[model samples]
Every structure is written in C-alpha cells, then in structure tokens.
Target: MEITGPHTNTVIEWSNLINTNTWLLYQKPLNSVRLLKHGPDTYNSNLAAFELWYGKSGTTITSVYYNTINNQNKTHDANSDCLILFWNEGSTQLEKQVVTFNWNVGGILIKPINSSRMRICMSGMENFNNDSFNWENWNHEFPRSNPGININMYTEYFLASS
Candidate 1:
C-alpha cells in the first residue's frame, strides 16, 4: 500500500554490515496502515508487500519496501517485530535490489488500522523473550551508531535485537 504521511517511522538492517547471520529491525507508532486490493503499479498488484513513504517538513525523506526475510505464510499482530525491509545503507547510496513480499495471506484489503508498534525480527535473536537485545542488551542507539553515517533522526522507533 502507498501511504504518505508523517510519524510513519522506518528502520533498516543490513545483513552484510552487521557481520551476523541475522538481525532485528524495529519500526513503530504507525498512524494509518491498511492493505490495498492492488497497489498503484502492476508489479505489486498481486503481492502482499507493504509500501511506505516517510516524510518530514512537507517532503518525503525516505521510501521503503517492507517484508519479512523468510519466505513463508505471513501474518501481522502486536509484538510482531521480525519485519524486514529494503534499506539504502548509505546516505548517498541506493538499495541494490527490490525485495517484495511474496506471500499472500489473503486478498482481503484492510482498512486503515492504527497499529501501535511493530518489530521486524530477522533470522537470529530468537530467545523467546520480549525484552533485551542480543549484543547491546540495553543500548537504544546501538543500531544507529554502528552504521557510522548520518541516517534520519530517530523519528519513529528504536532498534533492538530480541
């Protein structure tokens, strides 16, 4: 779905950068979220990908194509943070490939439901607990610090590995 608005925060995780097999990225405080029957483009006409446009100061700061890394039956609910997305790792670099959500949970288009928060958990960090990360267990800024670049301000959510 194409959504243009503010407070629609986004996060990213690069498999090669972190030097780990898997990681977790978090995004939250979604104001308006829904699934469209078909996206504006023919490519997304039959997939389950969530398209987001994040803006600040009346201009879109970033565009994101989001999905879970694992290819399988997909579902969304509260506390579901294993959400993955295509990320442009550098301020002057573009994302290498476009990853689409390839599963169809159903064709049902959901109306805008204000979801509170969500975390996209990648392959690792499956401790079965809800609190604390894997490495920097209590550091809120660990993800941003490691990137070594000026990403957008921490506008919407925190990054943590579970």
Candidate 2:
C-alpha cells in the first residue's frame, strides 16, 4: 500500500531494523509497530491514544505521547503536545523531499474515535478454555539463548471526525 499527502513529501527507504536472527514478511505474526497522533488534549486520557505493538500477544513495547513536546527550544503550551512515533529510535531524523512512491511523513496524527473499539492480536499457542481460545492467558515468552525473540507489529486507526 502507498500513502500520499502534502506533508508526506520525503523519501523514506523501506528497511527493517531487526536483529540478524530476525526476518520480516507481510504474513501473519508481526514484530514491532508504532502509532502516532498529532494532537491530543491529555496524556492518560484515551482521546488520541496511539498504541505500538512488539513481540507476541499484542504487547506494546513503545508508545508515543500525543501531547509530548519534541524540542525544548520551542515554547510549550496547551496545544504544543502532539503524538510522535519514530521507527529508528531517533537515530535518523526525518527530512522533507519530494519523491515517487518513496515518501515519509515526519509524523502522523490520527483523529479521535469517540465510540469505537480497537483490538490488537499477536502470534502464539492458543490457550484452550471451554473449547475456545482463551486470549487472556496468552503469554509472550523469550528465548534464554537469544537476547530477544523475533517480533512483528501492525497498526490500524479509526476516526469519527471524517
């Protein structure tokens, strides 16, 4: 899939920052994912909550603050907070440059959904409870031999404000 917009004018090379033992595919079971919202009112409030998933069982490893300020050099106010997510742990900064299909928006902000439900799932053995999948008992285990297990992540956004 491809996305285009005025703000998305930078070319972002698609690359995975996974471990050597890790591999990525468009199939089931994702490793890591990030979500960002440009504007939000509160931190704890779920007005514009963005979730990031890593590993299995829909575990969120990183969560971007919607209202958190980026640089301290800029003055902060009530409207200063915006949700921001980085793919490379702030290693490479995002730049704006026109390109074909290779483009990136410095940050993405999603509008709030008032009465909607968002659900995330991960890969693992299903726990049988009453002859059905008991997702509550699902646990993500790590390998003692490796630093961390391979992970896959996915993101979806719902909006009520058009």
Candidate 3:
C-alpha cells in the first residue's frame, strides 16, 4: 500500500477522539450489519460518534466519520471484514487499525460489540484514564492465527493508530 502525502507525519494528535463505525452484527432478528453516515461536525474534541444500519439475514455495510486534521485515507477489506482510516491536513485527525488477528479457521475470540464499546476498549488500553492520554503502553492482545479446533466461522476487522 502506498502512503498518502498528508499522512507522512510521525505524530498523531489525540486531542480529538477518533470515531468509529457502529457494529450492527447482532441487531434483533437480523444477521446482517450496516455502516451509518455522519456529518462533518459530528466529530467532537473529546469523542467521535457514528451510526450503524442493518438488514435482516443479508449483507452488512458500514460508514465511518472521524476528525480529519490531515488529508489521508486507507482502507482494508476482505470477505467478511473491512477497515478504513482517514485523516485531514496537519496530522490532527489521525486514525489507524491494527489487526491483531485476521479471519481464518478461528475467528475473533471477542465477539463484535457496539461501536462505543469497541472504541472504549481500543483507546482505553493506552491511557486507562482518558485524562492522561498515554498510549506508549497500549498493546493489542488478539490472537493472530486460528486454533486448530476452532472453525473459520466469520471474518473480522480492526482499527488502530500509533
């Protein structure tokens, strides 16, 4: 993958919370997922908000909006998983996705949770407390490969940043 020009910065600002797409996997009676649309100002300095839509027993789609301080965009998509990252100029809106594990015979141990929960888990690992904003110790703990006994039932996706 080629790196975009505006994303060449080495530092990603954490002043604005990176928003994510909502997970619609387990919405009542339906097995599908969908991504919701967001407006420009939807991203706040402290938090990012997103929407999720889904249909019953069908495919899933998701759309995410995040603060963009720098002009950059990246996307990863395969079978049942997809990930996207984007930022505006100045490197203020930094976004990333770290795939601790990919979809194979074994799926993600942690089931897909709502967007808010996922965001808390992902960003929380670093600073434990939002006030400190220390991400140096943030480490991803998902399994990289599938266990022999587990079946490749579904695909997975993740977002991360440094």
Candidate 4:
C-alpha cells in the first residue's frame, strides 16, 4: 500500500546521533491502529531481520522493533522519561544511500497516523514489562519470540498539539 501527502514529501533520516536501540510504538490515548502489508526486496540477509514486540503499560499499549542496522535514537516522553539503551558497542556506520528499496531512495517509509501521540520502536529488545526497563533484566529469558503481529516502524508518528 502507498500513501501520498506532505508527510510523504519528507525523507527518512537514518539517525546516527540518537544511537537508540528501542523506540515507543504507541504512546497511548490512540483511536486505533491497523497494520499494513509490505514486500521487502531484501530477504535472508540482516537487511530484513527486523522484529516487533508488543506490550502494555496499564492504560497505554506499546510495541517495539529491533533493526539490526539502525542509527536513529528515538525516545518516549509523553508523561514520563523513557529512553532506549544505545548498544553501539561495536557497530559500524553505513551510508544511507546504500540502503534503498524498490524505487524509493534512502530506506523505510514511516506513515503517520491521526492519534494523540505516535512513536517508532526501532531495533532491540527489552523486558516483558514495559513500565520499567531494568538494564539488569535486559537479558531476561523469555519464550515470546514468535512475532504474531507487526508494527509499521517505517512511519514516523508524532504527538498531537493541544
């Protein structure tokens, strides 16, 4: 599926500064979310080894992704301070131009949704609980590995102004 608007005119910037490993998908107080189907040009390679995890924070629901090759460092700051650990311990930089799909340049496309607030959980994993991301428990062993759903991280959603 394809969408066109002012948001489409914007280009995706593969961030190298944020250096984040996680991002908040849904911040809460949203109308509803529906997933879109995508056919990637890259497969069997790390280029398309991305995954998404779903969890809840009482009233708000959220999801996250793990992009093996990420540069964006996005955080969640709606009601509290939520930051993703930047595990740039041994990562090499790559040109964004090298990462292209179909006829589109750059990379993935983030389509914004009409909601109170929106975010993208880039690459990496965390604990089962979304309330607290204890580094000590970052390596918590869980069997919920199979991805039953998907979150369109390509779309960059933002908070609605009051």
Candidate 5:
C-alpha cells in the first residue's frame, strides 16, 4: 500500500483513457502482481489486457509476451475476481491467470533480470480502437463493492513518474 514512485496510493477507479492506463514501477528483480477485476460493465469487452515492458531506462519499452484476464461471466456477481501474473519457477516465461468470479484472491510471481524498471500498460480489449474509450472508463476496485469502479493493485515498487 506504500509505494514510492511516479504513482500514488490512491486507487484508480473507472479511469478514462487520458493517461491510457499506463504506469511505471520500479523493477525489483522479482515481482508479485495482483489485479482486482471490475464487473461485466467494467470494460468494453469485459476483459483486461496488460503489456509489461522490460528494458533499460530511457529505451523503447516492450514485452515479449502479453497478459490478459477474462471476467465475462456474470453468474456470480456476489464474489470477487482477479487477474494474476507470475513467473513459473524453472521456466523463463511469465504465466497469467484469472481468479474466476466467487474466488476471493489470486496472485502471481515474476522474475525479470537485465532490467532496471518495468512499465505496465493496461487496456480494455475492444476499446483499443474505439472512440468510446474515455467515456466508458475503467474499473480496478474490489468487486461487489461500489460497482467495482476502481483499479487496485499490490506490489513492492511504488508507481514511478514518467
């Protein structure tokens, strides 16, 4: 909850596309990532997309793999869902998964070397080229609460300024 970087402790809720849901975090050789999911009305496609950029400072940031979470099933709106990402031990790749509705918690661990920082870019699947991105807004809040209008995350590094 206490991060020291370009981002604040203020949880983001129903965020527009102004900053494009982009964030910078201090790279900690290893990271634990947890993404709180909104309800079906959360995104254009009810799916969350993520791209992690790994590279030295001041360079073009890109990820060799992308991450995604699907929250399309509204059968259990009384519960919470999340998107977790982590590195599988003994492997050099990242794995992404979603804690389906009714699930309380889920998380992932990732280890990235040869880099000093990581850039996280989040987006709603179908809003990429749609003109309604800003109006629709994004959700990252605790599910079954306030309509899940916030984007909440937990990690070691604070949100760094761009």
Candidate 6:
C-alpha cells in the first residue's frame, strides 16, 4: 500500500519525561517491512543518521518526514518485529522479539496514530510520567560478538555504562 490512515497525527507532543539521549522501545507485527540498512536521515538533512527497517507491510504512513524531534512532517510505516536503530557513542544490550530492544541513536518512544498500525511518532527522548511508554536506559559497554546470556529479570540489568 501507499501508507495511509486516519488521525494522520503520528506527530506527538510528549510531556517533560524524556530526552534525545535515551532509548525507546515498542513492538511490531512481524516481517511486514523491508529490513533496510542504517544511514542518513533522507527526510531531514540536519538530523542524526542511522539505519532502520522503514515499516512497510501493514503500515499506513508516508508522504511526511519523521525523526528524533518532530513526528510531524514525517510519515511512518510502522511494522511488527521492527526495530529503529540510532547509533550514538556507547554500547547497548538489546534482544529483539522481546521487550529488550532499545533504539538509542536519539532515543525513541513510538505511539500509534491509530489502532493496528505501526505508523507512530518518535519524540526527542521526551519524558513523561504516569502514561504511555517513556522509559529510559544506558548503553551497554560490554558487547560480545555473539550473545550467550539468556536475559532474566534479575540479570537483565547486568549492563553498565561506557
């Protein structure tokens, strides 16, 4: 599809609870988007660059440009099992298909414009309490070529800063 939907308002206005230097997490349907590589912000020339799987299948978005700041102007094609990566200067511990993934490039927190659509908004690490996903975390300093640890709630936080 050409990425269309109601609300047309994935652009969010988050409260004081997040920043651009935090990691954002969310969920997607699965294999709906083309797993593309990371690079520059084709939409915004003045924003940080990175690779992401532009949500394709089951997504209703496009025609706009989105980034770490304003969700407006950006059309998002949200997908399930999808991940948006932003590589800053730190190590990160992430496990996909679980609630263990965090896009720390500029920190993200996606919100559906409507129901059943991956097309959402990303705020610049905005922080808000008693509401939607506004979680935060640090980058992992220890990175193994291949992960071996089975993430448990207790040991899940076994990560440290750089």
Q: Score each candidate by Cα lDDT.
A: 0.25, 0.24, 0.26, 0.24, 0.28, 0.27
Model 2 stretches astray by more than 4 angstroms: 1-30, 35-48, 52-54, 57-60, 66-132, 135-162
- The TM-score obtained by model 6 is 0.22
Query: After superposition, which runs of candidate 1 have C-alpha atoms over 4 Å from their true positions?
Result: 1-16, 21-24, 32-150
**Which candidate comes out best when scored by lDDT?**
5
Which residue runs of candidate 3 sit more than 4 Å off their true CA positions? Answer: 1-41, 46-63, 67-70, 73-92, 104-162
> lDDT tens digits, residues 38-94, model 6?
222243333222233334334643321234434332344443223333322122212
Write model 5 residue lDDT over 1-162, tens digit each, in one string. 333453445354443212332333434322222332322332232233232222222222212222232323211111112232222112222333223221222222222221221122222222225443332222221112233444343333343222
User: Candidate 6 — what's its lDDT?
Assistant: 0.27
lDDT of 3 by residue, 1-162 (tens): 221222222222222122432221121222333322222334443333322222222233332444233224222232223222222222234444322112221111122233112221221122224455343212222121111211111222222222
Q: For residues 10-36, what per-residue lDDT tens digits would candidate 1 score against the true structure?
A: 333233224322221223323223211
Worst 10 residues of 5 by lDDT: 73-82
Top candidate when judged by TM-score against the true structure: 5
TM-score of every model versus the real structure: 0.20, 0.22, 0.24, 0.22, 0.27, 0.22
* Order by lDDT, highest first: 5, 6, 3, 1, 4, 2
lDDT of 5: 0.28
lDDT of 2 by residue, 68-144 (tens): 53433112111111222222112222211111111111222221121122111122223234456432211111111
Comparison by TM-score, 1 against 5, better one? 5
Q: Which pairs in model 1 have colliding backbones?
A: 81-119, 81-120, 81-121, 82-119, 82-120, 82-121, 83-120, 83-121
